Every structure is written in structure tokens, then in C-alpha cells.
Subunit: 206 residues, 3 copies
């Protein structure tokens, strides 16, 4: 005649024997209605935390924006001829890509001109928080991060003498955060009055 | 209503009478071009702050990343007997989920070994900012956040003597931010030289 | 022998060849290797820091954390006193903040009030550039990130630590100026500066 179908270009296909005309569709992205209509299979957007589904729209995960917990653990000082430890109760605040360990004021013993203050995160963290969550973005690299000046009260029983010492995040290894404390010179003493200190550093992600 | 030849499998359908061949399409998901082409319906994704439209593309609202304003208000000290206030002009910087109150150096009066420094945000905040914008993510919980060592000059008219005192964000209550100032020992004085100080803490979002 | 008069779009029957095909918008649809019509997977128009994190929409890890270092000159100037020291500091860009982790160093005399300038014109290692150190407040004079720092002043003997006030004052043409003042002073010729971390919101454009 002057009107019929000889060939059929994909996705269309005409079976040469039965002459049935059908269409090839990718079932993972398309489907056919109960009404026999061709439709697109609705799929939800693929989001990577911190990007998330907030109130139906695409937003920022509130967990990422603010998370709180606390650590009830052992803080230990180590220096030339010295080694002691104190139990401390500190709040933990994870805001964006930063972790903040809010240490309270505490009493310690003698300190050398240079020493290390170690926070043991292997134990003490309130679930669902874990040791791994305290890892810095720079992992276990030795750095001089967040250096700050801190005034510690040194005494031998009498009125304390406040020495200004330099403190910074030095390294995190196997769940133990090591802080370097040094400088300011030293006087003979047996006790120390440490001020409340907030230690912050970029937290490791993904 | 009508009848179609079994030869065209849905979504295709051959009208047995008119012998017109057409296709069934779910209009809510598919449409036909001006060029007669089958196309997918363009969907508009819902974005939730901080995720916003950045020049047609999907990005992070510049408002969330950085905002600047200022507070011209009253800073008041209170410490067992001693009580006084000073007017201060400070810049406010909201960067990501943090608020930064950049207090300038100011002169105050006597201070006790332990006391509170209150910033009154119910008044003095410059638009667009509102008192509510200063609420911490931990809203009114008593904490020991952002503890730091600060050197204050104490004097009685003569050359000042600088005492190292411990300062931290203690609590935010009904628009008033209370900072704890203590430790470091005291000396007899009538005036105090406070250094410029930046108070930072995670800002509330909902 | 099998009449088929007319094919409604997107279908189209060529009256000459009698070939039946379909019109599809290639920007939204495509045809499989298996000859199946499928939805064309395209990525949306994303703006940094929002990136295409392995298949989906995520936050670029580059925005969350980026490290580098500066090997440059730190120079002090105040009431006629001028001097410089070479310093090696780590630089950490986390979110919208830049952190210059300065190490402890030795300097010379300092006045009651002076400026400490970090020259970012040179010394920045990849992927950093001078422009990357610009604050969000550009070259506005501010009193940002004020903190108390203890510097050791000496004349050769045991140092005396004076508590001085320090803050980010201004960034200009690649040079970050820090104000150092207050706390009084004493006669000295040398200074022991402690390690200091300078942080401020980084510019984005």
C-alpha cells in the first residue's frame, strides 16, 4: 500500500514474524501504568552527609551543625621526672567540622618546663560517641595546632603563683590526644591549679 | 469506549478503526516538546537554608557563611558586692554555626576573685540581628564553654598590675550572656583595664 | 498489507521509507546499549562548597578540610622598632575559617604597641595562593579574634613574661597585620614569642 510500517528504529521494534510492535524501556528508570501509560519511576535525590533531607527539601543535617556529649575520663601529665593523672568531667561539642573539648578547672601536681597533657579517649565517652570520633582531620600528624597562652597556678601549699605557659594540640594517637604544655619558666612547687580550657581542632570526616 | 488492535503493545496503541498509531504518556512525569519530542518533566528541588540557590546553581547561602553586625550595649560586672557597668561597642561576626562577639578593650572598676560579666543583648543589637540570634546551640544550659586565660590590669591610680584570670561562657539567659571570670588571685585595687576579648560559641538554629 | 495511516508524535512514520521511529529529547532521555529508552542521568548545577561527592550531592571535602603551609617572613614594627624573622607555619582551612598555626620564635625589642605582619605575598605552598588568605571582611580594620598572649622579654638573662593583647587588625595586599599591645613593658633586647594560632573567617567569592 502507501501506508504501513516496514522498519522500526529502537526503542521501537517490530517483530518480523508476528508483526507485533512494542517498545524497549529500561525498567529501572521507567514503568508502564495500570492505564498503560509510559511513566518515569520517581526516585529520591542521592545525598551525602552533611547534605541531607531536611524537612523534605535538601538541607544541612542538624547533627553536623551541633552535637553534644561528654567525656568522663583520665587526664594525665607527663614531664621530666613527673607523671600524674586526674579524673575530669568535660563537655564535648561537635559543631560543623570542629570538635570542642571543654575541660573544667582542675588540680594537678608538679609540672616541668615542658611536658605533655594527655586526654585518654579510649574510655570515658558517653555513647553513641566513640573514640574514633575524636580523631583530628590531620589524623596522627604532629602539629602545633590551636596554640594558646594559659595561666597555671603553682604552689607548695601557700598562695599560688600564676605562670603563663604555652599550650597546643600536638598529636592524636590511638585515641589519646596529646597536648604540649611548655614555656613561661618555672618555680619550685608541688601542686598546680589548672584553669578551665577549651581544646578545639578540626574533626576527621568520612 | 474504543478498541485497539492487539498488535501494538502499550504504551503504544493502534486504533483499529482510524488506524492511527499513538502513545500513552503519563503527563505528570512526561511531556511532548514543541519539536514533537518526548521529554522528562523538569522538577524544581526544594532547598532548605543554609542550602540555597546560588546563581541558578545549588549552593550554600552566603548569609550562613558570613554575616557582620554590631552591638552597642551594656556590659555589667557583678561579683559578691562589686557591681558596675560600662557601655561597649563590639563587632559581631556570624560565620557558619558560630557567633563571635568581638569586645574591645575597656575600663572597669573593682573585681572580686570570682564574678560574672554580663552582655545585655536585649538592647543594643543592630539590625537585621535580634536578641534571639545570640542564643547558643546549648540554649541556657550552664556550661564551661570556650574557657580562656585573660590578663586584666588592676590599679588604684598608679601603674597597673596584670592578673591572669580564667574566663568562659557560662550561660545565656533571656537575652543576657553571662561570662564567668575567676581565679588568678587578687590585689587591692579600684580600677581594671580589660583587654579586647573575642567570645565565641555555637549559635542556635532551628 | 497492514494499513497504518498516521503516527502521532513523539512517534513518526516516514511516508516514503515507511520507517517508524520516535522523537526523544536527548537532553533528558537516551537509548541504552540494549536499545531501551532510559532517563538520561545528568548532574545538577552545583556550586562549591556543594559538590558532586561520588555520585550524589555532598559537601566538598576540600571545603571541610584543607592543609598547607607558609614559610615566610614575620615582621614586627612599633615606635621605630623594626625587625623580621623567618617562620614555618601550618595553615588549616576548615569550613569558612583559615588557621595560621605560628610556632614559637625569637624576636627582638617590642614597644608597648606595635604590629606583627605576616607576609603572604610569598611562602605559600600549593594549593594556596596569596588571595586565599583574604578575610571575609576583606581589608576592613577590625579587632578580630582578640586574645591574651605571654611574651618573654629579656636582656640576655632569665626572661620576664608580659601578658600582651593580640588581635587580627587588617589584611592588605597579601599582608596580615596583627596588633600587639597593652600589658606594660620593661627594658629588654630580646623576646620569646609563644606558638600562636591566628584564625579568622576566610573570603569566598
Amino acid at each position: 500500500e502507501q501506508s504501513y510500517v516496514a522498519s522500526a528504529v529502537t526503542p521501537l521494534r517490530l517483530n518480523s514474524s508476528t508483526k507485533v510492535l512494542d517498545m524497549l524501556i529500561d525498567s529501572s528508570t521507567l514503568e508502564i501504568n495500570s492505564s498503560g501509560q509510559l511513566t518515569v519511576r520517581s526516585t529520591s535525590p542521592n545525598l551525602r552527609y552533611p547534605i541531607a533531607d531536611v524537612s523534605g527539601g535538601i538541607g544541612m543535617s542538624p547533627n553536623y551543625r551541633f552535637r553534644q556529649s561528654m567525656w568522663i575520663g583520665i587526664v594525665s601529665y607527663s614531664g621530666s621526672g613527673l607523671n600524674w593523672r586526674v579524673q575530669v568531667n568535660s563537655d564535648i561539642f561537635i559543631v560543623d567540622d570542629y570538635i570542642h573539648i571543654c575541660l573544667p578547672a582542675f588540680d594537678g601536681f608538679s609540672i616541668a618546663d615542658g611536658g605533655d597533657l594527655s586526654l585518654n579517649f579510649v574510655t570515658g565517652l558517653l555513647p553513641p560517641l566513640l573514640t574514633g570520633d575524636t580523631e583530628p582531620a590531620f589524623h596522627n600528624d604532629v602539629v602545633t595546632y590551636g596554640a594558646q597562652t594559659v595561666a597555671i597556678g603553682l604552689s607548695s601549699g601557700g598562695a599560688p603563683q600564676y605562670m603563663s605557659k604555652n599550650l597546643w594540640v600536638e598529636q592524636w594517637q590511638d585515641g589519646v590526644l596529646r597536648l604540649r604544655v611548655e614555656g613561661g619558666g618555672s618555680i619550685t612547687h608541688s601542686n598546680s591549679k589548672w584553669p578551665a580550657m577549651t581544646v578545639s581542632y578540626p574533626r576527621s570526616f568520612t
